[PDB]
Structure 1
Amino acid sequence: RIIVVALYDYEAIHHEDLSFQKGDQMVVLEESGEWWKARSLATRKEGYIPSNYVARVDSLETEEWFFKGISRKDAERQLLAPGNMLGSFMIRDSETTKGSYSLSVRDYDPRQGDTVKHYKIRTGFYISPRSTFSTLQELVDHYKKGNDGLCQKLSVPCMSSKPQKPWEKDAWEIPRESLKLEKKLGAGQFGEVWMATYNKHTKVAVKTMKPGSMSVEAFLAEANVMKTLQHDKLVKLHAVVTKEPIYIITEFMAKGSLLDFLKSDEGSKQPLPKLIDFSAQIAEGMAFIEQRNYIHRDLRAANILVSASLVCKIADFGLARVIPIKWTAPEAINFGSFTIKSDVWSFGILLMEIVTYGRIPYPGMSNPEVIRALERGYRMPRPENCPEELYNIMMRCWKNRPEERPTFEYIQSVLDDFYTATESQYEEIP
């Protein structure tokens, strides 16, 4: 007998799922992934619920200040998001000491501006050995009144949002009829991209492929692999229409591409540490792809999507294997040798695209002119706004020998703490 509680409001939009409000208790009848079968204690209706909108009663995730599954860097980003203030805090899982918790608090010093500082909580719980607490609420309730040591006293828990609703149960392959493609977003040499609607009540984005040599069969073989590359900085692949012409249904990304975003009004008021934060997100996306032994092939700003809350996501991973040299590494251009290391090269140019607010690479140069410029060891110069240490990453990304190029793991780690010294990652307190 298991009892869960609703963390958010949810409105039913399918045949057999349930409507519930925040605070609603319900009984778990069945566990099966993103959708669970429950029994509402307020309506007594048996039906389906999203398994990420609930958690066990009295458990840790029921608390407003607790954030499950957040890395130190995610906590920093969520707490620097609009709607938070001094003392905005969260207790979360430790990313380094597995099974322990960490406190992240929004601070301000006039020399850097707003920051997020992190504290390790030790197993009973304590941050300062001087002061121990029985529960995590006792901890919180203490530092909430004055800061017995902290950079700031605790004010209000961090701003959260609804997680995205999980795609319908067993619906990887859908009939084309479910779609209303409402507006063309883009059109290229291989197909179109549309804002659409799935079964009247779910906004999505649809990539329609122009029926080329891309074998029906051979595509699904690769699409079923893209379905398994689920990361927060990879775009979410929802479904697929299996009959030629092929449709690719993904999550709708409000702000379009990174390229069109950097070139826009709102994109031009992004300070440099945000541009780097963007890069960090992408390097996290690639580190995952790298971890998973996989290849992007077409890494550039036009294939990176931006969401309404400015989270960066990677699109068309792999597509180039199934289906523009200024982004392409020499070995890839010369002998068709695409590796994760040729992506690192592509990541260097994207880095520059970011730092130049989307400006075309090698300005004034032709594709042939670029190729001969490379073979003589020419590289792009550092622009006015680029810090010197960020140029090194680009220059390291652009080494003649693939093996000499850094990993996305190391790149992510450098970009993540770009403004922080290793020693300042966690504040130590006596």
Structure 2
Amino acid sequence: KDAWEIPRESLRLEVKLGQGEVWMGTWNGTTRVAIKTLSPEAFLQEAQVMKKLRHEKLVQLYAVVSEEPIYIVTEYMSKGCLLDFLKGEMGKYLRLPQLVDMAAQIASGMAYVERMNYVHRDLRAANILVGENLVCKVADFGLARLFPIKWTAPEAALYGRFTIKSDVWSFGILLTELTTKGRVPYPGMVNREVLDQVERGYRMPCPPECPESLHDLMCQCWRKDPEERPTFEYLQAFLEDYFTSTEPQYQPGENL
């Protein structure tokens, strides 16, 4: 055992958040935590990745209970996943400046993943968590190592070529989720149709009210050639600086 191990006694599970299986609770009596119950060695591989990763915009591993029944413990993100946040009562007041900020924060987390030579493989709004003051943090490292086809770059879906560049593809798809309040990508298209179309050069259009400059950023993330796509470093700086350098005369609309 390493120094991330704790006694199971120290964990008070309370409110069930999700199943499939995450709980809200307390650790050592004072600490609000999230706890993920459950091959049990493939379940521990997630915590393995999470021990190596530490960044303000990645959900923080606190502790493991490496003996069955097993638990992974992290910081608690008060507002649940981005997907549900976007589609629920909060979503309707989110405008472009809040949404590009959330995206900058996600980009920043992924820039860290990029610097560390990791790949996420499951980057999407269902795998981002929201806290207080609209903090967004990259979650779910089950497929991370040193797939829903609608978010997955073609080379990775077909041939198994997952790289930081296919995460960049996924990020472009996540930007459509932000700007549509979390609608499923490629409306009215099934998986197979998405495959066929994307291969014939099809890309989703500019969502209503989304500046063309942001849609152009999506299209760059969606370059057929993985090496043509921008880095997260570029994405983070572009999105941080957006309302000064790229759309200085942005005007608020009904939806964005």
| TM-score scaled by length of structure 1 | 0.54
The answer to whether the aligner puts 1:180 opposite 2:12 as a matched pair is yes
Structure number with higher helix proportion: 2
Q: Which residue of 1 aligns with 2:120?
A: 296
Per-residue displacement from partner, 1:259-295 (whole Å, max 9, x unpaired)?
1111121222011111001101111111111011111
Aligned letter for 1:215? E
Q: Which residue of 2 aligns with 1:54?
A: none
Q: Which residue of 2 aligns with 1:203?
A: 32
- Identical-residue share of aligned pairs (%): 64
Q: 1:361 to 1:398 in 2, by over 3 A?
A: same
The answer to whether the aligner puts 1:390 opposite 2:219 as a matched pair is no
Q: Which residue of 1 aligns with 2:44?
A: 219
Distance in 1 separating the partners of 2:32 and 2:107: 28
Question: 49, 57, 64: which is aligned to 1:240?
Answer: 64
How far 1:245 moved relative to its partner? 4.0
Distance in 1 separating the partners of 2:3 and 2:95: 41
Distance in 1 separating the partners of 2:61 and 2:31: 14
Distance in 1 separating the partners of 2:245 and 2:176: 24
SS at match of 1:320: coil
The answer to whether the aligner puts 1:363 opposite 2:192 as a matched pair is no
How far 1:199 moved relative to its partner? 2.6
Aligned letter for 1:172? W
Question: 157, 169, 188: which is aligned to 1:345?
Answer: 169
Aligned letter for 1:338? F
SS at match of 1:180: strand
Per-residue displacement from partner, 1:60-84 (whole Å, max 9, x unpaired)?
xxxxxxxxxxxxxxxxxxxxxxxxx
Per-residue displacement from partner, 1:330-376 (whole Å, max 9, x unpaired)?
01110111100000000000010011011111111111111111111
Distance in 2 separating the partners of 1:364 and 1:414: 31
Alignment of 1:24-423 (within 5 A): 172-188=4-20, 192-209=21-38, 213-215=39-41, 219=44, 223-317=47-141, 319-321=142-144, 324-421=148-245
Contact 2:6 2:63 in 1 (8 A): yes
Distance in 2 separating the partners of 1:343 and 1:260: 21
Q: How many residues align?
A: 245
Compute the RMSD of aligned alpha carbons.
2.1
Structure number with higher strand proportion: 1
Contact 2:14 2:25 in 1 (8 A): yes
Per-residue displacement from partner, 1:89-118 (whole Å, max 9, x unpaired)?
xxxxxxxxxxxxxxxxxxxxxxxxxxxxxx
Aligned letter for 2:24? M
SS at match of 1:195: strand
Alignment gaps of 5+ in structure 1: 1-169, 425-430
Distance in 2 separating the partners of 1:269 and 1:205: 28
Distance in 2 separating the partners of 1:421 and 1:342: 27
How far 1:175 moved relative to its partner? 2.0
How far 1:246 moved relative to its partner? 2.7
How far 1:171 moved relative to its partner? 5.8
Distance in 1 separating the partners of 2:97 and 2:169: 22
Aligned letter for 1:348? G
Aligned letter for 2:17? L
Alignment gaps of 5+ in structure 2: 249-256
Aligned letter for 1:219? L
